[PDB]
Design a protein around this ligand. Structure first.
Ligand SMILES: Nc1nc2c(ncn2[C@@H]2O[C@H](COP(=O)(O)OP(=O)(O)O)[C@@H](O)[C@H]2O)c(=O)[nH]1
Length: 178
């Protein structure tokens, strides 16, 4: 019904553990936007709305509109996005797939982020290819996923990530081919 007009996309962050499940929600705060703000990483409530544009990106989920965390009625998706975090040093792992399986189950466009590019052992395009093995093809290749090869440790690609996000946030309406 017409009892909603503000639409904060619930960009659920997922992927494998140790690749930065919760650490990226910290890393993301210690990149910009929130420093003293009681959100994202505390205890009362989880995650937050990041200010790349104007807080239009609620990472993970918000109570009432859970997409990739839990599907209450499934159809909580309007034009939401999922982030799939894969360490370039580790790649696709057990729970990483389960995050993919949840994503493809709905068949939502992904925002992959290959972390640990701070590591000289980073193999981004390698672990990136494992995603396309679960049929997650980057838009650099012509599939349906925006990958980012970032390092949440050197705090490089977290900045580049929100850039790709805002790109999507701007094209959100009709832009994809045009
Ligand atoms: N090298 C590297 N390590 C990372 C990065 N992001 C997270 N980590 C590591 O991920 C580990 C697990 O993070 P934590 O939030 O405690 O665990 P999780 O939330 O269960 O994945 C941490 O000890 C970090 O060292 C990254 O971008 N690069």
């Amino acid at each position: 019904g017409s009892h909603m007009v503000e639409r904060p996309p619930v960009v659920t962050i997922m992927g494998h553990v140790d690749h930065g499940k919760t650490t990226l929600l910290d890393a993301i705060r210690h990149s910009k936007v929130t420093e003293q703000e009681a959100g994202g990483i505390t205890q009362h409530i989880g995650a937050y709305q990041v200010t790349v544009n104007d807080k239009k990106i609620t990472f993970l989920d918000t109570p009432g509109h859970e997409a990739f965390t839990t599907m209450r009625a499934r159809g909580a998706q309007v034009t939401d996005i999922v982030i799939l975090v894969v360490a370039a040093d580790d790649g696709v792992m057990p729970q990483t797939v389960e995050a993919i399986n949840h994503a493809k189950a709905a068949n939502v466009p992904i925002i992959v982020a290959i972390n640990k590019m701070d590591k000289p052992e980073a193999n981004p395009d390698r672990v990136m290819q494992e995603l396309m093995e679960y049929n997650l093809v980057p838009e650099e290749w012509g599939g349906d996923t925006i990958f980012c090869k970032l390092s949440a440790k050197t705090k490089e690609g977290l900045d580049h990530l929100l850039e790709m996000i805002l790109l999507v946030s701007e094209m959100e309406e009709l832009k994809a081919n045009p």
